[PDB]
Nucleic acid binder design. Structure first.
Ligand code: 91T
Ligand code: MG
Ligand code: MG
Length: 540
DNA sequence: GACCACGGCGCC
DNA sequence: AAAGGCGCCGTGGTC
């Protein structure tokens, strides 16, 4: 039992803290404590006590650092046993689970959290002795990345609130036009947001053909993929699909985001969760700014609401065909390496083939559709689904996924090699040695085993791309600070920066070069960069 | 007011 | 719906 000692703690103590709510930019700091050398220090008043700390070292360090930044204090995050645990096994995503697994209990009291941070760090650091590549990821990627994310979180992004308020009222009237039409076509009103009520209308009352079933409960599905297949069978289907687009966008983005502007900053603040995915990707939450719309016209209007501070510009940088370049390097395939030493475009080539269109005329919306295909195909799509996704006979679907792989021969050999390894060692790994455990590779149920296989051989690709982006963020951040620029958002293979208008061009050039040269591969990494007043206009 | 499962769907 | 990775919505049901 730790000796209760007076605040403040010595240098290097492990911190524990309790927030009123999970979001650091919104939380009240209820209690603060620290632990070292067999002592626990409980702060009499936690906000004032923040100033005594040189570094947030402990569980969820980045969250406390964001809160410190909100208060104008430079309290960078350091060691965090969650990052160690996450690198050992990315299923380690919560403090509850990590505590249970590596020697304690996550409670609701700062002193115990500080003591727990200290014990867990000792034990996890032991487990990582001799895992030289994981230790490198920790010291060279994750631990410094957490500083970057804290600054992104605390900086936020500006949003055109008035513009969105106006858009809500317009979309509201159109939703009423669509719903009124649906209720007439059904002969009666019902809750069009209830997929159970819609299922009855569509397949019992109107006797439309039920195509597919839902996964867990076996209901007749009303998914867009099912509705797409029925849009000719009935005019109500078309209106329902339009109703779904508008209500999805209004309820998820248009209406909520303007209520989340922070009173102190006047900006919108997401969270970049650093121990949340099986592959090493970041995730974004509260709100998720990694799934802001972009595909449809209305979606594009929402994206335009993300704007630069007055007298600044946004700079948007996006890696080209990133996971395909990573695949070329991991596999060694020559026909593929060649494709990227020759600056060819496959999302354009596919978009030309599936549209019967010269590459000159593949517009931005055709190229996305081709990304569904190329990635859908590569990570294990079925001929049958493929035949449906791009509307061609099944026999055609088989051909695309046969030429898609014989054109690039040594991919399949890399797949087989990755699965064999994952079976023997129990995990697969990225170029840098990030691991994902995939136990079901020897499941005796084919469907389970084969799903495990698609998860296992995807991870080195998606996770290497994630390692590269994280490393680029870590390299780029100090260069932006020196140029008075900011890092705002990451969206997996994309960064959005904010720069003074007078240095925006120099920032964009520098950023592009840092990202392309992050870690040279057997193919070049290319980055598309754009500058604009709003997120959309900054992607050309 | 809280929680969860589910279907559904937004992005990468 | 049908052979990768996420988080948030409304419904429905529950406590
Ligand atoms: O299954 N996936 O793995 C996947 C699907 C999608 C998608 C999509 C299109 C629509 O959802 C919206 O239109 C993306 N991924 C992965 C692979 C890609 O490499 C990386 C970065 O995604 P993205 O930048 O969009 O593609 P990519 O870098 O290749 O090409 P660009 O040159 O920048 O256009 O995420
Ligand atoms: Mg890209
Ligand atoms: Mg992208």
């Amino acid at each position: 039992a730790l000796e209760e000692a007076p605040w403040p703690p010595p240098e290097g103590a492990f911190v524990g803290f309790v927030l009123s709510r999970k979001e650091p930019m919104w939380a009240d700091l209820l209690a603060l404590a620290a632990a070292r050398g067999g002592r626990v220090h409980r702060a009499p008043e936690p906000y004032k006590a923040l100033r005594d700390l040189k570094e947030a070292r402990g569980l969820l360090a980045k969250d406390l650092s964001v809160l410190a930044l909100r208060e104008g204090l430079g309290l960078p995050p350091g060691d965090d046993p969650m990052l160690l645990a996450y690198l050992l096994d990315p299923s380690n995503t919560t403090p509850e689970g990590v505590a249970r697994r590596y020697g304690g209990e996550w409670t609701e009291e700062a002193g115990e959290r500080a003591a727990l941070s200290e014990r867990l760090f000792a034990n996890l650091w032991g487990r990582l002795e001799g895992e030289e590549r994981l230790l490198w990821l920790y010291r060279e990627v994750e631990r410094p990345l957490s500083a970057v994310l804290a600054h992104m979180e605390a900086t936020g992004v500006r949003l055109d609130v008035a513009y969105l308020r106006a858009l809500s009222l317009e979309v509201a009237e159109e939703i009423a036009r669509l719903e009124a039409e649906v209720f007439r076509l059904a002969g009666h009103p019902f809750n069009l947001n209830s997929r159970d009520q819609l299922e009855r209308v569509l397949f019992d009352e109107l006797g439309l053909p039920a195509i597919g079933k839902t996964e867990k409960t076996g209901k007749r599905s009303t998914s867009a993929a099912v509705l797409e297949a029925l849009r000719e069978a009935h005019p109500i289907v078309e209106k329902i699909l339009q109703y779904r687009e508008l209500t999805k966008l209004k309820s998820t983005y248009i209406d909520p985001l303007p209520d989340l502007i922070h009173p102190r900053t006047g900006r919108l603040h997401t969270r970049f969760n650093q121990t949340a995915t099986a592959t090493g990707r970041l995730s974004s939450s509260d709100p998720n700014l990694q799934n802001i719309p972009v595909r449809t016209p209305l979606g594009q209007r929402i994206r335009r609401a993300f704007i630069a501070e007055e007298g600044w510009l946004l700079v948007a940088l996006d890696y080209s065909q990133i996971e395909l370049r990573v695949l070329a390097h991991l596999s060694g395939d020559e026909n593929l390496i060649r494709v990227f030493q020759e600056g060819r475009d496959i999302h354009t080539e596919t978009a030309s083939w599936m549209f019967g269109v010269p590459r000159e005329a593949v517009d931005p919306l055709m190229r996305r559709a081709a990304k569904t295909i190329n990635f859908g195909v590569l990570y294990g799509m079925s001929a049958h689904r493929l035949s449906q996704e791009l509307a061609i006979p099944y026999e055609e679907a088989q051909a695309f996924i046969e030429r898609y792989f014989q054109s690039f021969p040594k991919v399949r050999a890399w797949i087989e090699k990755t699965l064999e390894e994952g079976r023997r060692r129990g995990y697969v790994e990225t170029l840098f040695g990030r691991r994902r455990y995939v136990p079901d590779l020897e499941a005796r149920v084919k469907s389970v085993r084969e799903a495990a296989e698609r998860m296992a051989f995807n991870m080195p690709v998606q996770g290497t791309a994630a390692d590269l982006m994280k490393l680029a963020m870590v390299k780029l951040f100090p260069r932006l600070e020196e140029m008075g620029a900011r890092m705002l958002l990451q969206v997996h293979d994309e960064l959005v920066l904010e720069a003074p208008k007078e240095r925006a061009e120099a920032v964009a050039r520098l950023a592009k070069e840092v990202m392309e040269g992050v870690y040279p591969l057997a193919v070049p990494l290319e980055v598309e960069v754009g500058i604009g007043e709003d997120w959309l206009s900054a992607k050309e």
